[PDB]
Homo-oligomer: A and B are copies of this chain.
Amino acid sequence: TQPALLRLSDHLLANYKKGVRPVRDWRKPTTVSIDVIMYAILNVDEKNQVLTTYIWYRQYWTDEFLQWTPEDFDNVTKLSIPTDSIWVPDILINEFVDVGKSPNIPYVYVHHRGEVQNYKPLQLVTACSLDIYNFPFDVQNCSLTFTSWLHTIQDINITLWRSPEEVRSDKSIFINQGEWELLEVFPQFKEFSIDISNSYAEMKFYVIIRRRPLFYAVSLLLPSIFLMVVDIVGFCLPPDSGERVSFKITLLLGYSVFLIIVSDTLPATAIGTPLIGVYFVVCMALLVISLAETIFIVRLVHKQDVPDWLRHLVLDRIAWILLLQELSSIRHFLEKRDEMREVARDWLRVGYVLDRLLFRIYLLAVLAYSITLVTLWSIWHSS
């Protein structure tokens, strides 16, 4: 006598058709459960609005023809079969824009009551809407819809194998060391008809993820905050100090390089914009502004007199704030060291006033930036 593992495999696979749906009455569908686990988050391309994941996609369904009596064959109740030798459902992710590179599992299991169990390490790449407004603290609701491309609901009703609560909690297999965390995955059924009789079963999986903003924080914000503080203290100087002006130039160069670094190297998609680079743009803007202002005042150090305009403007401004003759050749030579103050000094002083006012409001800008930052931190920690 032969092995029953041969005799049964000879029985079940002979006179079988991989194309014909495995059912005796066509009017019934062949229902298909699934189960999804997130092994890891391989990569997140914020620019192209796509996602890279690796999952352990299980699958279960029934085949009327893959049935036997265990007692007739060695009391056997399971059997390995090649997946390519039987009918298989053409499940497909709606967001699957590009083919996933993953190895084909050459076998499946079968039970003595038509059941089938196909597991595989499905790797996938999908599209997703990615918000960059909270760029370090970004949290997403990327989706994974599961369905047949063609087979209607009347042939294939997608279902779930595990219970949904069990699915959301399941973090049995995950690599936390990645840049991106994972919070849960909510499954939900849906029916989908673009037009009549095109009913298609569906099973959405609201994948949720959270970024670890530590690295971005230390790498980006703290250098920016140091730049902010050096601008803050640089404004303390008196305007026509020349290398006060060159110091604002130094800060301009640093801010320029950093602002450049943002979309040089850091992810910044075209849709929307993050507020962080916005605030940095603003601070650089105010820097160059008062760079021009102290330069204006430096021109005004040279005797130059528009003081009427200036004067009523500062009034409204602060309203809104609410032989011996020859040895006196040498005397005059001395006092000419600062005799030009009689014109230079009014404009010098009011320029100093501008410097300090502008300094206060720039400080307020940096304050708003920090407030926003702490708000985003709290929101990130909120879930």
Interface residues of A, Cβ cutoff 8 Å to B: 3-6, 9-10, 13, 17-21, 23-26, 39-40, 42-43, 47-50, 54, 74, 76, 80-82, 85, 88, 90, 92, 96-99, 101-103, 105-109, 117, 119-121, 123, 127, 129-130, 149-151, 155, 172, 175, 177-179, 194, 211-212, 214-216, 218-219, 222-223, 226, 229-230, 233-234, 236-238, 241-243, 245-247, 249-250, 252-254, 256-257, 259-261, 263-265, 268-273, 278, 281, 284-285, 288, 291-292, 295-296, 298-299, 302, 323-324, 326-334, 336
Contact = CB atoms under 8 A, between A and B. Distances in A.
Given A19-B82, A76-B26, A270 B216 contact: yes
Contact of A123 (B97, B103, B237, B288): B97
A150 B92 contact: no
Given A257-B256, A292-B230, A334-B329, A80 B19 contact: yes
Contacts of A172: 194
Contacts of A5: 20-21, 23, 26
Contacts of A76: 26
Q: Is the interface of A mostly helix, strand, loop or mixed?
A: mixed
5 contacts: A3-B25, A49-B175, A90-B106, A329-B331, A334-B336
Max chain B Cβ within 10 angstroms of own Cβ: one of A24, A236, A249: A249
Nearest to A170: B194
Given A238-B299, A326-B330, 9 more contacts: A10-B17, A19-B85, A54-B97, A98-B101, A212-B271, A215-B268, A223-B259, A237-B295, A250-B252
A3 B65 CA distance: 11
A83 to B, nearest CB: 10
Max chain B Cβ within 10 angstroms of own Cβ: one of A123, A241, A295, A332: A295
